[PDB]
Amino acid sequence: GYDRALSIFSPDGHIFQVEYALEAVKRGTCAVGVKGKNCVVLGCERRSTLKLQDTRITPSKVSKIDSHVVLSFSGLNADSRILIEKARVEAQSHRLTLEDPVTVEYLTRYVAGVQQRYTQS
Amino acid sequence: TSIMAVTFKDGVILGADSRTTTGAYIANRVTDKLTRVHDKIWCCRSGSAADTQAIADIVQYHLELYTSQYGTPSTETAASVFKELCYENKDNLTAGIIVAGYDDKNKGEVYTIPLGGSVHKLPYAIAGSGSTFIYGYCDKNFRENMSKEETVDFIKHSLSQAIKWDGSSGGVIRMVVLTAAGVERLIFYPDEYEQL
Amino acid sequence: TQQPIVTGTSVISMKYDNGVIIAADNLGSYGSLLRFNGVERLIPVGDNTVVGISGDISDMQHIERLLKDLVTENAYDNPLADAEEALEPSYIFEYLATVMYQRRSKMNPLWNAIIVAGVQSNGDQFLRYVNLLGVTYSSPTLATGFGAHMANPLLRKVVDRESDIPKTTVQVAEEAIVNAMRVLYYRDARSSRNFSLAIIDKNTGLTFKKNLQVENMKWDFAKDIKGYGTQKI
Amino acid sequence: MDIILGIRVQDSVILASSKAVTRGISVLKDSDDKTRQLSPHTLMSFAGEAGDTVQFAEYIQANIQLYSIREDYELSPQAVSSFVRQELAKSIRSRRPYQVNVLIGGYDKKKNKPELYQIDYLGTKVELPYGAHGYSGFYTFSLLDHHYRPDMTTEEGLDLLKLCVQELEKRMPMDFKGVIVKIVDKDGIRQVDDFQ
Amino acid sequence: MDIILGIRVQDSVILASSKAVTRGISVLKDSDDKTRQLSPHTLMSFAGEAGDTVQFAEYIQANIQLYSIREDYELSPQAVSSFVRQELAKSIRSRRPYQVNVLIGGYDKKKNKPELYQIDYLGTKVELPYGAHGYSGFYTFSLLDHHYRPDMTTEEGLDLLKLCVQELEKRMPMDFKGVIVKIVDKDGIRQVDDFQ
Amino acid sequence: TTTLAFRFQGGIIVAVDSRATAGNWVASQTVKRVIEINPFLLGTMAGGAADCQFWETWLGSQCRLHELREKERISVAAASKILSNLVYQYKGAGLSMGTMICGYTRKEGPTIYYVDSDGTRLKGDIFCVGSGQTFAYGVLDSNYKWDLSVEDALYLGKRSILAAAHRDAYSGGSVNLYHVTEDGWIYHGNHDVGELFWKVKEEEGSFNNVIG
Amino acid sequence: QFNPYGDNGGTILGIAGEDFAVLAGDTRNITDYSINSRYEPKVFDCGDNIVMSANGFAADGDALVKRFKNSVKWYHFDHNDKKLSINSAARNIQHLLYGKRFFPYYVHTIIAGLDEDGKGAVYSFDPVGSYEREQCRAGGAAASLIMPFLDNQVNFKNQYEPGTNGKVKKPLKYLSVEEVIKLVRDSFTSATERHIQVGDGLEILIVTKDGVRKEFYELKRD
Amino acid sequence: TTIVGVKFNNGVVIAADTRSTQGPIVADKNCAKLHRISPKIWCAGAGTAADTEAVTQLIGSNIELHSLYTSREPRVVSALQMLKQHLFKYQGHIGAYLIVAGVDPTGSHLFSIHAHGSTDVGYYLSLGSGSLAAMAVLESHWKQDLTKEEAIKLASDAIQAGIWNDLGSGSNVDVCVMEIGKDAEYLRNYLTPNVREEKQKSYKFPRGTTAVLKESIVNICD
Amino acid sequence: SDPSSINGGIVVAMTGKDCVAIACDLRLGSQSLGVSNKFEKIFHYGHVFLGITGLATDVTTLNEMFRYKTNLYKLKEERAIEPETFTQLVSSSLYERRFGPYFVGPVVAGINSKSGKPFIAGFDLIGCIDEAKDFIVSGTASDQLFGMCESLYEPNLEPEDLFETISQALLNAADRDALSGWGAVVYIIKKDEVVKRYLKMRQD
Ligand SMILES: COc1cc(/C=C/CCCN2CCCN(CCC/C=C/c3cc(OC)c(OC)c(OC)c3)CC2)cc(OC)c1OC
Ligand SMILES: COc1cc(/C=C/CCCN2CCCN(CCC/C=C/c3cc(OC)c(OC)c(OC)c3)CC2)cc(OC)c1OC
Ligand SMILES: COc1cc(/C=C/CCCN2CCCN(CCC/C=C/c3cc(OC)c(OC)c(OC)c3)CC2)cc(OC)c1OC
Ligand SMILES: COc1cc(/C=C/CCCN2CCCN(CCC/C=C/c3cc(OC)c(OC)c(OC)c3)CC2)cc(OC)c1OC
Description:
9 chains, Proteasome subunit alpha type-4 (chain A)
C-alpha cells in the first residue's frame, strides 16, 4: 500500500514532479498535427538513435482509439501505452452505454482526467 | 397428566392429578381422571380427552350389557374390551389407559393399555406425560403386598414428583381405593403433597 | 434466527399513586419440564429501576450482563453517577428498546419480552414494554405472556385509565398483583408458586420482596367433582 | 420458444432468427433482430432469457470490437467462439448465470472458409454444418440431415432454410412472426431484404 | 387455450372457433370443428380440457336429440342452455368435472330472435350480444364494445368478426390456424366456407 | 392498470389510467402513472409503483448530470439505456417495472423504448403495458395511422384507455394525456372515466350494450 | 421460523383543508386479540409544521418516525436552519422508505401540513416509498370502511342536484376545520363499531399557519 | 365471544356477550348466543356460529321427541350425552364449543363440551376468545354457596372482562337464569354498557340527489 | 382461488319506516375481466326478496332451488311464504351442504303480510343467521358497505329517503371495489307496492 505523496507543492507554488514530466516530453520525438478544411493530419518524427530496426513490427507513433479518432504522443513510450489502453476501453464502454461513439472532445477530456489524477494520488 | 394404579394386599388403588391442559393454558384444574366402568372396575385415562371419555363410555356400556347377561365381568375382561376398541381403532385414537379392579378370586389387578392397543398385566402401572420423571422413583419404591396406608403414600409421593416436574400435571391428587370393603374415594390438596 | 429453549413465563406490572409494582415468578421451564426453580427474573438496576424479563433465559442472562455494564460505564468519568447523572429508567429502556430492534433487524433476535419499571427523578412513574420485535408501548398496567390475557383484565379493574392512578394506593395495587399471581398459578401450566415482587416508590425507594408464595388457594370444591358428566361416585 | 437457425454452405454462412418478442400474453414486437455484428466477418445470433440475451450479446460485441482496435486485426471465427465459450462457462458457475444460447457465423478471411459454431448457456460449444437452439432442431434437423450438401450455393442454402421455416410455421404452436436472414461471406455481412 | 367467439346480430348468431389442435409441441391438426349442432336451430361451440370437451358436447347433443324425438318438438335456445348450465353445475361438484366452456348460439323460432349464451365449466351462464372463452375476449372485447350495433346485418357482423380475428393473429402468442365460422338463423345452420 | 404510448407524425402521445388496487380494494383513483423525468422525457408507471416512481426520478437526476458534463440533450437511447442497465444489475432481487421511456430529439425523432425489470429494452412505435393492456391494443391497432392529426391522436390514446378502463377491473379512475414534441411535452389534462364514458358513448355511438 | 414483522392495528386519517390540514389516529395498540394499550399515540409533531403518522407494524413505524425527526434536525444543521418544506419532507421520506426496499418498513405513512402557498396538504406513502399528494386518505385497519364515506362526504361523489336528475354534479364547497373535524369523528365512531382493532381514543393533530394543536376524543372501549 | 356458566345454591346461570365477528369485522353488534335446548336447559355457543346453532337445534329437537316419548322432563345429562356423541362422530369438524346449563328433576347442572367431543363438569366455566379474561375474574371472585343475585353479578362481570379486554367480544350482556323450582328466566340485554354516541351530523340526503336511469313498479302477486 | 371472489358483486339491505330496501350491483366478471353488466343478484318469491352474492353458478343454482322450494310451499300451504319462514328455509338449505357448501352470501328482505313489520336477514355460506334490524351487507365490497352504512343509516326513514340512503351506500362502496359495479338496482318495498329503480353510475 505505497501512498507516499510524490506530487506535492514547493514554496513557489510549483509541482516539481509534474514539471519534470514536461521535461520528459521535450526529450521525446517531435509530433505535430494540423487541421485541414475537411481533414486533420498527424505528423511524427522517427527516432534516429539506431537502425537495423524492424519497421513492420515496431509500434507506430500514431494510435487509433476508435475507428474515427487517433492519438499521437511525445514523451515516455511505456507511459503512453497505458494511456492508450485506458482510452480504447473508454471508447468501447462509451459506445456500450450510450450507443454513440465518443466525440473527440469527450475522449480528450477523458485522457486529460486520467493524467490529472496521477498528479494528485 | 400423571396417572397410576398400584396393587396391594387388600386390593388396588388408582391415582391421578387433576390437570387437563390445552397448550400452556390449564383448561381444567379439577379434572376427574379416575373413571368407573363397573362397581369394582375403574380406569385411569390419558391422551385425547375426547377419545378417552368416548372409549370409557363404550366400555361402560359393554360391561353393563355383559353384567345383565353373564353376571360380573372379570377385570381381565374389562381390559379386553378396552384393548379391542384401542387396537382395532389404533389409527384414530390417542389413548393410554390403565385398567384396574378387584375380585375375591383374584384380589387387585392392573392392566396397562398404551398407544399400541397392546395390553400388559402389571403389579403396578404408571402412565401419562408426568410418568417419565418417576420411573426411577417407583422402581426403587414399589413393594408387593403393601398395606393400604403404605400404598396410598407410595402413590402420594410418586404423583407429587410427577406433578412437580411435569407442567402437564397438577392440581389435586385423586385416588380411588378398590377392596372387598368396596369403593373409597380419596383427595389430596396442593399444600399437602407439595411439602413432602 | 433461533428458537427459545429455557424459558420464563409471565411478567406482570402496574402503576399506583406513588410508584410502580412489578412481579415475576421464579421458574425456568425447559419445554414442559419445569426445570429450574431458583430463577430470578426481576433485575433491579441501581435503586430506581427494575427490569422484568420473560422469554429465553440465556438471552435474559445476556441482557442482565448488558445492564451491569451499562451501570459500570455510567460511573466512568461521572462524579454524578449517583446524583443528577444516575441511570434513569427512561435511559435504560431506550437503551434496551434500541438493542431489541437492532437484533430483530439483523434477523437474530433476543427471544424476550421486557417490562422496565421505575420512578423518574422528577417523581414520574415509568412503565413501558418491549419485546423481540422491538415493539414498544405504555399503559398503567402491562403484562407479558399469559399475564396479558389473565393478569391485565384484573389489574385493569383497579386502574382502568390515567385518572385512576392517583386514587390507587400501594396496599391496593400490591394486593391486586398478588391476586393476579395466584390466578396465573391456577391457569398457566408453565407457572410456579414461588415468585418475586418489587415496589419502586418515589418516597420509600426500591423495596424488593423474594421467596413469596401464592397463598389462600381454593381447591376444596374439587372433592365434590366426580366423573365427566354422567358419573355419580 | 425463439427460433435460432444456422447453416453454412460452400462459401457462406446463413443465420435465421425469429422476429417475435412476447411478454406473457402479448406479442410486443414483430420486427426484432436477434443478432449482433462482432467483426466485419463475424455474426452472432442469440436466444434465451429476457434481459440476459442482449446484455451478453453487447458485452461480447464490445470485447471483440476492443480487441480489433487494440491489434488492428480481426480475430478469427474460431477464436471469437472460444472466447464466447469461455465467457459462458464462467457464467454458468457464477451467482446468476446468463441464460443465453448462441450461434456464431463467420467467414475466416485467412482460410477462406465459412464456419458455424453452436454454443449453449452452459459453455457446450460445437462446430456444425447447420445448427439450432431450443426446439428448433426437433422440427428442422430431419430436413437438413436429408437435403444438406457441403457444396451448396447460398441460393440452395436459402431454399433449404425456406423449407425449414415452413415446417416450423406449420407444426409449432407458437407464432414467431417470421425470420430475419443474414449472410456472412467474404464481402462481410448482409441481410436478405425479403424472405418469406 | 383456443378461440371461442360468438356474436349475435340482427337476425342470426355467428360462431367463430379456432381450427388448431395441439398436443405437446406439435400442432396435430389445422382443421378442427369445435361445434356440435344440438337441434337444427341451435349450435354449440366448446373449448377446454382434452377429452372432456367432445365427450360433453356429444353427451349434450344426444340429450337434445332425444327430447326432440320424444316431443316431436325443438327446445328453445333458452331451454337448451338452461339444460346445459345445469349439467355443468352438476359436474363441478362431481368427482371429476368436465373442464369445458361453451357458447350456445340459436335462433328462437317462436320468438323470432337470435340468442347467444355463454357458459363456463362452473355453470356460469349469461346471455350476451357478444361473448368469448379464454383469453379470446381480452383482445377482442374492446373492438366489439366499440363497433357493435344490435341492428347489424350479418355481413356487418362478419366484418367486425374478421377484424377481431386479425387482432388475435397479431397480438396472441399462439398460432390457432384460423377460424371456422358458422351462422345460425331462421333457416338453420350454415358454414361460411371462406374465412382466410 | 393501463398505460400506452405511441409515436406518429406529430410526436408522441402518452396515455395512462389512474387506479391503484391492493387486492379487491381500490386504494386510489388518482395516481399519476406518468413520471415527468424532465421537460423532454416522460416515463409511464406499471408493475411496482415505488420502483417506477423512484428509479425514473433518479433517471431524471442522471439525465441532468449528463447535460452538464456533455453540454447537450441526452438521447432517448442513452436515457433509456441508463434505466435499463441499472435495473439489470438488480435482476433476481424482485424489482417490478414495466415502462415506456418517451422523448423527442432532433437526432432521433419521436422515440419510445419499452423497459422492464427483466432487463428488456425495446425500441418500438406502439406499446401498452399493464392488466388492461390487451384492450387498449385492440383500439390502437385498428386506428393507428402514422399520419394521424394531433387532435385525433390525442383522442385515440384517450379512447384506448377508456376501452381498457371499462373492461379491466384494475384500470380506471381517470385518463391522463400527454403530447411529446421536440420542444418538450405538453400535458393535455385529466379526464374522469366516469364522465368520459357517457360522453363517448353518447357522441360516438359505441358501448351499445350498456344502459344510459 | 422467526417472523420479523407484526401487526399493531390502528387506523389513521389525513385531510387537507384549503388553509389547514388535520391528521388523526386512534390511540389503541393491539396484538392479535389482545389490547396492549388504550393510549399509545401514533400521530406526531416533527417540527417545521409537519405532523406524521406511520401506521402498521409499530416497531417499524416508530423507527421510521425517529429517523425522519432526526433528518429534520440534520437538514437544519446542514442548511442554516432552513425550514423543511412539506414537499421536501415527502421526497425525503421516499428515500428513507426506499432504503429498505428489500426489507421494508411494514407501515403506511401519512404526513400533513401546509405547502409553500399556505394551502393545506397531505402526502401518503407505500411501505416502500411510493407517494402522492392527496386531499384525504385514511390508512390502516379500517381504511376501507372510511374511504368510501370520505368520497361521498368530502368530494361529494355520486351526489347531484335534486331535480337535475344526474345532469348537474353537486358543487364542491370547501370545508371549515370544525366541519372537517366532524367528518373525522363520525368516521371514527363508525369504524369503531364495525372494526375490532379500532377504539379507546381518537387523537387529532391540527396544522395551520399558527402551528400545531391537538384535540382528543373518547372512543368506545370494547 | 365470551360465554360463562356459574352454579349457585338453587340453580345455574349462563351468560354471553353479543358480538359476532367475521375476521376483524363486527357483523352483528347484538347476536343472541344463548340457545334453548329445552325450556329449562340452555346453551351458550362459541366457534363456528352455524355449527353452534345447528347442533343445539338438532339435539334440541331430539330432546323434545325423547321427552314426549318417555313422558319425562328433559335431563341435562342427556343433552350432554347426545351433544358429545354427535360432536365426537365428526372429529371436531363441527366447530361447536358449548356451555350447557339446566335444571331437571335430578337437580342443577353445568357442563362444557368441546368440538372434538370431550366434556367437563364444574361450578364455574368459560369459553371463547374472552375465555381467559372471564376465567381470571371467576378465579378471583367465586365462592361456594352463591345466592342467585351473587351468581348473576359474578357471571355478568366475567363477560365484562371479555367485552373490555377481548377484541373478539363486545357490546351487550345476555343472561339466562334457571332455578330449581321455577321457570327459566331469560334476560336479553341484561346489560347494555356500549351505546353508540350521537353522530356529529345527520347524513340524510336531499331527495333527487341520486341519479336514476329507469323506474318500474314490480309485480308481487300473480 | 377464493370462490367468493371470482365473480364479484354486492348486496345491501336496509329497513325503514313501514318499508325495506334491497340493492345490488350488476357486475359479473371472471377475475379482472368484466363479462356481463346485466347480472342481477336480487330475486323474489312472492313478496319475499332474496339477494345473493358470491360464486355466480351458485347464485344461479340457489335461485332455481328456492323457486322450486317456494313453489311447493305455496302449493301445500295455500299461502305465500313469509320472510321469517323463508329465512329459516335458506339457513337449513345452506347447512344441508355443510361440508361442501354453496359459495354465496345470501340476504333476505321483506314485509310480513300479516304482522306488517319489515324484516331483513343475512347468512354466511353454511347458514348462520344474521338477524339484524338495521342493515345487512354481502359480497366483495362488504367492508366498504359496512363503513358506509354505519355512517349513513338512521332508523325509521321514509321510503323516498331510505332510497337515497341505500343508493348512496351501494354506489360509493362499489366505487371502492374493483370487483363490483357496472350498474345497480334498488328495490323499494312496501306492503302495497314495490318499486324498482336502476341507478346511473360510472362504468369502470
Ligand atoms: C398424559 O396425557 C398426555 C398424553 C399425551 C400423549 C402420549 C402419547 C405419545 C406419542 N408417541 C410417543 C411415544 C413414541 N412414539 C414412537 C417412537 C419413536 C421411535 C421411532 C421408531 C420407528 C420405528 O419404525 C420403523 C421403529 O421400529 C424399528 C422403532 O423401533 C423401536 C422406533 C410415537 C408416539 C401427551 C401429553 O402432552 C405432552 C399429555 O399430557 C396432558
Ligand atoms: C415411457 O416411454 C415411452 C415413451 C414413448 C413416446 C411418448 C409419447 C406418449 C403419449 N402421450 C404423450 C403426449 C400426448 N398426450 C397428451 C398430452 C398433451 C399436452 C398438451 C396440452 C396443451 C395445453 O395447452 C393448450 C393444455 O391446456 C389446456 C393441456 O391440458 C392441461 C395439454 C398423451 C399421451 C413411447 C414408448 O413406447 C413403448 C415408451 O416406452 C418405451
Ligand atoms: C399495470 O399494473 C398492474 C400490473 C400487473 C403486472 C405488472 C407487469 C409488469 C411487466 N413485467 C414486470 C413483472 C415481471 N415480469 C417477468 C418475470 C421475471 C422472472 C424472474 C426470474 C426468476 C428466475 O429464477 C431463478 C430466473 O432464473 C431461472 C430468471 O432468469 C434469469 C428470471 C414481466 C414483465 C398486475 C396488476 O394487477 C394487480 C396491475 O394493476 C394494479
Ligand atoms: C400436536 O400436539 C399438541 C397440540 C397442542 C394443542 C394446540 C392447539 C389447541 C387446540 N385449540 C386451539 C385454539 C382454538 N380453539 C378454540 C376455542 C374457542 C374459540 C372462541 C371463539 C372465537 C371467535 O373469534 C375468533 C368466535 O367468532 C367467530 C367464536 O364464535 C362465537 C368463538 C380450541 C382448540 C398442544 C401441544 O403442546 C404444546 C401439543 O404437543 C406438541
